Design a protein around this ligand. Structure first.
Ligand code: CLA
Ligand code: CLA
Ligand code: CLA
Ligand code: PHO
Ligand code: PL9
Ligand code: SQD
Ligand code: SQD
Ligand code: LHG
Ligand code: BCR
Ligand code: BCR
Ligand code: BCR
Ligand code: OEX
Ligand code: CA
Ligand code: CL
Ligand code: CL
Ligand code: FE2
Lengths: 97, 30, 34, 243, 56, 37, 137, 38, 334, 34
């Protein structure tokens, strides 16, 4: 029984929040202070077993840690989807304006 | 069968070109 | 390809019938007295 | 020393570096030192495709094919960690580089076989106790083969995975079930295997060269049909460095 | 597509039975099985009411 | 060009037309069943 | 509809203060924006980085906030990435990099105010079209 | 494929030479009226 | 006469059923090669990766096309303007995959048609005619050059040449509209005036001449028999024709001079089509149609759409949908 | 009925081709001088 995995993923938290394991990096522009520095660090250090694990990325400033903490309510994690993360698509998913 | 039809019609047209040129009724000054 | 199975006869008669009409008229023209 | 203008349009740019016949030395491994491959290059010379068994169900063979996508096939500028393991084996952990090429080869009779020839996320290991890399060293390991098309790719009727229609819009009232395999795009991710056989070593420079053979699946057209089995053979080159 | 393999027919006693082959002349042909010596052991009966040789 | 003297007129009278059409149509009526099979 | 004083009234700072631009300032703003910015920011988008636009909400969520005259003027003096983390004057037009972006050389403080005001007023007029890209053309 | 290449090159050169030398062969004189155009 | 002299006499012979001539010496082999390659490809060529993205497009009848859908597909975008003769390929299979037939055909065709034009001059010279029929032929020819050579050059790839096929032709047109807004370009409008006008004057002229034919036949025979090939007397009454058309509009809007009339008949479509061709050939360098997108603005600054903007929306649909897998970056710059 | 889908064009051409040949011949015969 054949499933479109992206559509299916849209029915998980991926469709509701920024998925640290899958969502393309431009989504981090949605919230103050995340783009591009933290966005880059997050994508680079993905996947994460839980949202809070994002606080454990090495080299972070106290400022960066606080911004992340203020933005945890906007993050989620789901299983890594090959279709969303191959091709460097997390950095450029072929969508512009 | 479609392809056969198309190529056939084309070939008929080319043959027609041949007859229309070399076996035309000759123009004659009266 | 899943073509219309009547396309062949349609095309064939489309070519043949008027072509034959014309050949009949031409040939019966040629055989008239000069 | 050759420049781009010397090389451009010659075909040489799709070739891996070679080492001359005198390069039969040994490159010492200090197990206290960390190492990297600074450049891994793979130049395919032959693509073989496993014929689909007639139904006799004997051993279907790999048959030769003709490359139609020209000299666009090599993987190069690949780099990654070269770990020294506790048992003295070396493990290459591919990090990055031009580690894939779409390639289309053509079978006898005309069938075209697209594949993503790749070593993405290659993890290849030697035999234990390799105190030096020699012309007797080999690497064997596996890699990832993602879908030949990525998720945005749209088929000729506009259907796709991450984009596109989800139905056969040209057939508004056709029964969907028979078309499901075409309507519902799927993203393949499979494993490939590769052996690197070192034939030449420059002990002084850290350069090694040899032959490779890889085995992987070809394009499955986002789940529309069964992929073919491909065996790729060619030459390789790598520069080992302390890092 | 493929050879299914060679079919060997046997009765309940384990004797090998041989299907009588269709000659080219016949558009249709009955199904009759004999032993190695040509003695009838099985068939597909037309009329069943007095069948003696059914596969069953 | 100088004309060809081997040329002959060709004829088919009406009776021969009717006979021919009869032949063709009856042959068609006979064989058609086999063409459709 | 008219280009009223209310439309031309835009936030001066983050502290609730507004400034009312004149019609001539708006025109100057359009002209100077076209002159210095539109090559990349035509219609409110960004051609060399479409992920970042000139929509007011986006500017509001930039660091430091850019959804006011002051934020935009400072940006035009000392542009940063969207999170404020690095200074990007070296690859983005600014007064600070007027040496390498020569069109910024004749831009005055007044000019910067006019451009900023254009950037804030235009979406009040054009709505989704501003920063919308081709979808909304 | 080298032989095809050489063959085509030779053919093309042949016809081109025919064209050029042909128009060089007193073409202005080849008309039904005034031929002395030299 | 020696052999060369004899050969020259035959080549330029006015008695050959079809004139050969020196232009014909180049034209014949090139057009034969182009024709043969075209026909063979159109029937039997395998799909071609036109856009260089390993997404082969089937053009030939045997690979699932009919006459309307069929084409010889343009060479790969990966090739660009590189010369891709058969011998640059490692194999015919490669040559075919990458669209070599397209280059072979269009290059032989363009050479051959240029020679066709020269040949028209040549024969006009041999027959003691005035020489400018070929100049009229320069109008369609230039247009072919525009779509097979100049546009590819400007855009940097023969993959952008017009495909050799009916639907491929339509593809080329739609994409051209998307990328240059050609309808809004005055050279294309002049082209349209050229062909609409050409047809109008053709029908008009036809109708007036036909209308003033002198009675030479009975009602039970075709009036065409009223004219005998090579007769000295004109077969219609131009004074009556002019008398009619001059009253239809007004006297001075009608031609009483047959030569002036026929010159007009030659010039209108030829000049118009020259402008069409120059339109394609200059949009080849992206000097595009008029852009009145958001030209009309109300007092507040609200955009007030005009028909140009609706055109713009259609153009947008075309732009975003064409070659759906070829673009990785937001602007289509060539 | 599951008939051969070429039976129709086969029968049609079988009838039409020779019938036409004969009609051509007859008509060009009639037009000849009496
Ligand atoms: C009228 C004859 C004619 C002509 C003009 C061409 C022309 C062309 N064919 Mg060829 N072709 C021909 C007959 C001809 N063909 C025939 C009969 C065949 C069947 C055997 C073929 C088979 C064929 C194939 C299979 C192919 C071609 C292709 C080519 C092209 C490249 C040729 C080349 O590189 O030449 C190199 C030769 C020269 C540069 C000549 C230089 C020597 C002279 C003496 C110097 C002066 C020339 C100079 C340039 C200026 C011109 C003079 C002018 C001022 C009057 C070219 C478009 C290829 C193609 O189209 O690729 C896409 C290709 O694949 N052709
Ligand atoms: C009544 C219907 C109508 C009219 C008036 C026009 C009018 C015009 N069309 Mg349009 N067109 C039409 C229907 C019509 N079109 C249709 C149904 C279609 C298809 C959907 C098109 C498609 C079309 C296209 C694609 C294009 C045009 C364009 C043109 C112009 C040139 C047409 C031409 O040269 O024809 C040939 C006819 C002549 C050469 C005869 C002369 C005609 C002129 C215009 C009349 C002069 C009258 C004069 C003003 C009266 C003064 C009297 C004086 C003596 C006192 C022209 C302005 C073109 C354009 O946009 O130009 C800017 C263009 O590109 N038309
Ligand atoms: C009413 C609507 C309308 C009209 C009247 C036209 C009319 C025209 N269109 Mg336009 N077009 C339209 C709508 C319209 N278009 C729209 C809506 C679009 C957007 C989709 C376009 C997009 C468009 C494009 C992109 C182009 C045109 C062009 C043209 C012209 C085509 C004719 C030509 O080029 O002759 C010139 C003659 C030729 C091209 C023929 C060359 C013949 C060669 C020399 C010989 C061939 C021999 C052959 C193979 C064998 C012969 C038989 C054998 C037995 C001998 C013409 C001006 C084209 C153009 O202007 O070309 C210059 C052009 O490229 N149109
Ligand atoms: C689509 C429009 C169009 C076509 C197809 C066309 C076609 C033709 N016009 C000719 C002539 C002319 N056309 C003229 C004015 C015009 N012609 C126009 C529009 C057209 N004219 C317009 C609008 C005008 C007004 C300006 C003049 C003034 C002339 C002539 O004097 C000339 C002629 O002789 O008229 C009878 C003929 C040239 C003969 C030749 O070169 O043989 C050489 C080629 C041969 C024998 C075969 C080549 C086959 C090739 C190799 C096939 C492969 C390549 C093709 C391009 C593939 C095309 C595929 C399509 C699907 C696009 C040819 C029949
Ligand atoms: C209810 C009411 C009150 C009723 C009252 C009616 C009352 C009686 C009216 C009287 C008063 C009246 C006159 C007032 C007029 C009102 C008003 C002006 C009406 C305007 C109507 C209308 C829009 C005018 C349009 C103008 C006009 C029709 C434009 C088209 C004409 C066009 C421009 C011609 C130029 C083109 C020219 C180059 C054509 C030649 C090319 C082509 C024809 C060659 C063919 C050819 C030509 C030959 O030449 C000959 C020889 C031959 C062989 C030949 O092949
Ligand atoms: C599939 C790949 C393989 C391809 C192979 C094809 C090669 C063909 C070679 C065969 C040669 C036989 C041809 C003779 C027929 C002939 O033309 O004779 C007719 C006359 C009579 O010849 C006349 O002959 C006379 C003698 S006699 O009458 O023949 O006895 C003589 O008096 C006179 O000088 C002479 O002109 O010849 C001429 O008028 C001059 C030759 C003109 C031929 C030009 C061809 C133009 C082709 C254009 C390309 C477009 C094609 C697209 C199709 C629409
Ligand atoms: C305010 C702007 C400032 C000015 C700037 C100037 C701009 C340059 C203008 C260009 C000048 C044009 C000169 C024309 C002369 C000429 O053709 O003479 C040749 C003949 C002479 O007329 C014939 O003249 C004959 C006498 S004689 O030959 O002149 O001696 C006579 O016998 C005959 O009856 C008569 O019809 O002209 C004609 O045959 C009739 C006119 C036909 C129109 C020609 C134009 C070509 C077609 C239009 C182009 C198409 C454009 C639309 C696209 C589809
Ligand atoms: C692959 C390409 C294929 C295209 C080729 C086209 C095929 C053309 C076939 C031609 C056949 C036409 C026959 C001419 C028919 C015709 O002209 O006959 C009359 C004809 C008389 O000829 P005459 O010598 O009298 O000269 C009269 C001339 O005007 C004839 O041109 O006799 C013959 O032709 C010999 C054959 C006798 C045929 C008699 C049979 C008819 C009896 C009825 C049979 C059906 C009913 C049976 C009931 C049980
Ligand atoms: C058998 C059969 C088949 C069928 C097909 C057919 C139908 C065939 C045909 C018919 C046809 C239809 C054929 C043909 C061809 C044609 C011709 C043969 C023509 C001629 C050509 C030429 C010779 C000309 C040339 C000229 C020159 C010289 C110069 C220039 C001009 C011209 C071009 C004119 C099928 C597939 C079913 C199956 C198998 C078997
Ligand atoms: C539909 C059908 C199908 C198909 C069919 C076919 C395919 C046909 C074709 C075949 C064809 C395709 C026929 C052929 C032919 C030919 C003829 C009948 C003869 C001739 C010629 C001639 C008559 C000419 C004359 C000449 C001229 C040209 C020049 C000079 C010299 C001469 C006089 C000799 C089938 C059966 C499968 C099945 C069923 C149905
Ligand atoms: C400064 C320049 C340089 C150098 C230059 C060069 C040194 C070039 C040259 C010189 C030359 C060396 C040029 C040319 C060519 C010539 C001509 C253009 C020829 C033509 C031919 C004709 C036209 C003839 C005609 C005809 C013939 C074909 C046949 C018969 C008749 C007649 C005689 C009429 C370079 C590039 C390094 C770099 C940049 C700058
Ligand atoms: O290839 Mn045929 O079309 Ca001239 O633009 Mn860019 O490239 Mn492609 O897109 Mn749009
Ligand atoms: Ca070894
Ligand atoms: Cl957004
Ligand atoms: Cl497209
Ligand atoms: Fe006329």
């Amino acid at each position: 029984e054949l499933v479109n995995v992206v559509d299916e993923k849209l029915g998980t938290a991926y469709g509701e929040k920024i998925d640290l394991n899958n969502t393309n990096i431009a989504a981090f522009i949605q919230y103050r202070g995340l783009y591009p520095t933290l966005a880059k660090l997050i994508v680079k250090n993905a996947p994460y077993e839980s949202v809070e694990d994002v606080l454990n990325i090495p080299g972070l400033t106290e400022r960066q840690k606080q911004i992340l903490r203020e933005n945890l309510e906007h993050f989620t994690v789901t299983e890594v989807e090959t279709a969303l993360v191959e091709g460097g698509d997390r950095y450029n998913n072929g969508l512009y304006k | 069968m479609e392809t056969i039809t198309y190529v056939f019609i084309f070939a008929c047209i080319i043959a027609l070109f041949f007859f229309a040129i070399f076996f035309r009724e000759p123009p004659r000054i009266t | 390809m899943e073509v219309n199975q009547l396309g062949l006869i349609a095309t064939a008669l489309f070519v043949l019938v008027p072509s034959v009409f014309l050949i009949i008229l031409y040939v019966q023209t040629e055989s008239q007295q000069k | 020393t050759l420049t781009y203008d010397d090389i451009v349009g010659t075909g040489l740019a799709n070739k891996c570096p070679t080492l001359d016949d005198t390069a039969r030395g040994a490159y010492p491994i200090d197990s206290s030192q960390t190492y990297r491959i600074a450049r891994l290059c793979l130049q395919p010379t032959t693509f073989l495709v496993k014929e689909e068994p007639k139904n006799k169900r004997q051993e279907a063979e790999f048959v030769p094919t003709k490359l139609v996508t020209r000299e666009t096939t090599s993987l190069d500028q690949i780099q990654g960690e070269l770990k020294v393991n506790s048992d003295g084996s070396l493990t290459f952990v591919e990090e990055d580089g031009i580690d894939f090429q779409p390639v289309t080869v053509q079978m006898a009779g005309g069938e075209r076989i697209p594949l993503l020839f790749t070593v993405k996320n290659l993890v290849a290991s030697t035999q234990p106790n390799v105190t030096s890399i020699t012309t007797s060293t080999d690497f064997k390991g596996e890699f990832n083969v993602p879908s030949y098309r990525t998720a945005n790719f749209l088929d000729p009727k506009g259907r796709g995975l991450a984009s596109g229609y989800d139905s056969a819009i040209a057939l508004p009232q056709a029964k969907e079930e028979e078309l499901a395999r075409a309507n519902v795009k799927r993203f393949s991710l499979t494993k490939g295997q590769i052996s690197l056989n070192v034939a030449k070593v420059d002990g002084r420079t850290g350069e090694i060269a040899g032959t490779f053979e890889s085995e992987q699946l070809s394009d499955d057209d986002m789940g529309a049909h069964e992929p073919h089995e491909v065996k790729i053979q060619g030459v390789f080159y790598a520069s080992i460095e302390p890092a | 597509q493929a050879w299914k393999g060679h079919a060997v027919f046997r009765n309940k006693e384990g004797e090998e039975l041989f299907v009588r082959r269709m000659p080219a002349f016949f558009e249709s042909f009955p199904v009759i099985l004999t032993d190695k010596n040509g003695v009838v052991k099985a068939d597909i009966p037309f009329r069943r009411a007095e069948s003696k040789y059914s596969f069953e | 060009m100088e004309p060809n003297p081997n040329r002959q007129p060709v004829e088919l009278n009406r009776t021969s037309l009717y006979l021919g059409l009869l032949l063709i149509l009856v042959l068609a009526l006979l064989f058609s069943s086999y063409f459709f099979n | 509809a008219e280009l009223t004083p209310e439309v031309l009234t835009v936030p001066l700072n983050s502290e609730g203060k507004t400034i009312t631009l004149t019609e001539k300032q708006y025109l100057e703003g359009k002209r100077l924006f076209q002159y210095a910015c539109a090559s990349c920011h035509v219609g409110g988008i960004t051609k060399t980085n479409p992920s970042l636009d000139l929509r007011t909400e986006t500017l509001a969520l930039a660091t430091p906030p850019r959804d006011n005259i002051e934020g935009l003027v400072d940006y035009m003096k000392n542009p940063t990435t969207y999170d404020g983390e690095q200074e990007i004057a070296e690859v983005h037009p600014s007064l600070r990099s007027a040496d390498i972006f020569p069109k910024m050389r004749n831009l005055t403080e007044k000019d910067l105010v006019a451009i900023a005001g254009h950037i804030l007023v235009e979406p009040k007029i054009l709505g989704d079209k501003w920063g919308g890209g081709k979808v909304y053309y | 494929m080298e032989t095809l290449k050489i063959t085509v090159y030779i053919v093309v050169t042949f016809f081109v030479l025919l064209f050029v030398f042909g128009f060089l062969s007193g073409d202005p004189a080849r008309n039904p009226k005034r031929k002395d155009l030299e | 006469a020696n052999l060369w002299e004899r050969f020259c006499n035959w080549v330029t012979s006015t008695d050959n059923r079809l004139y050969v001539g020196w232009f014909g010496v180049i034209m014949i082999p090139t057009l034969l090669a182009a024709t043969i390659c075209f026909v063979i490809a159109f029937i039997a060529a395998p799909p071609v990766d036109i856009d260089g993205i390993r997404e082969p497009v089937s053009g030939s009848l045997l690979y699932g096309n009919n006459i309307i859908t069929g084409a010889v597909v343009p060479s790969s975008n990966a090739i660009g303007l590189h010369f891709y003769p058969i011998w640059e390929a490692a194999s015919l299979d490669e040559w075919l995959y990458n669209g070599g037939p397209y280059q072979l055909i269009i290059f032989h065709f363009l050479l051959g048609a240029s020679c066709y034009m020269g040949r028209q001059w040549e024969l006009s010279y041999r027959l003691g005619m005035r020489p400018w029929i070929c100049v009229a032929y320069s109008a369609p020819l230039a247009s072919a050059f525009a779509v097979f050579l100049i546009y590819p050059i400007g855009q940097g790839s023969f993959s952008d040449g017009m495909p050799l096929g009916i639907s491929g032709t339509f593809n080329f047109m739609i994409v051209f509209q998307a990328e240059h807004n050609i309808l809004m370009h005055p050279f294309h409008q002049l082209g349209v005036a050229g062909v609409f006008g050409g047809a109008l004057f053709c029908a008009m002229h036809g109708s007036l001449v036909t209308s003033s034919l002198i009675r030479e036949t009975t009602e039970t025979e075709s009036a065409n028999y009223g004219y005998k090939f090579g007769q000295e007397e004109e077969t219609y009454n131009i004074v009556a024709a002019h008398g009619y058309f001059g009253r239809l509009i007004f006297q001075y809007a009608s031609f009483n001079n047959s030569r002036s009339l026929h010159f007009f008949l030659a010039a209108w479509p030829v000049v118009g089509v020259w402008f069409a061709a120059l339109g394609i050939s200059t949009m080849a360098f992206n000097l595009n149609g008029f852009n009145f997108n958001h030209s009309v603005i109300d007092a507040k600054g609200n955009v007030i759409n005009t028909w140009a903007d609706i055109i713009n929306r259609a153009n947008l649909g075309m732009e975003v949908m064409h070659e759906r897998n070829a673009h990785n970056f937001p602007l289509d710059l060539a």
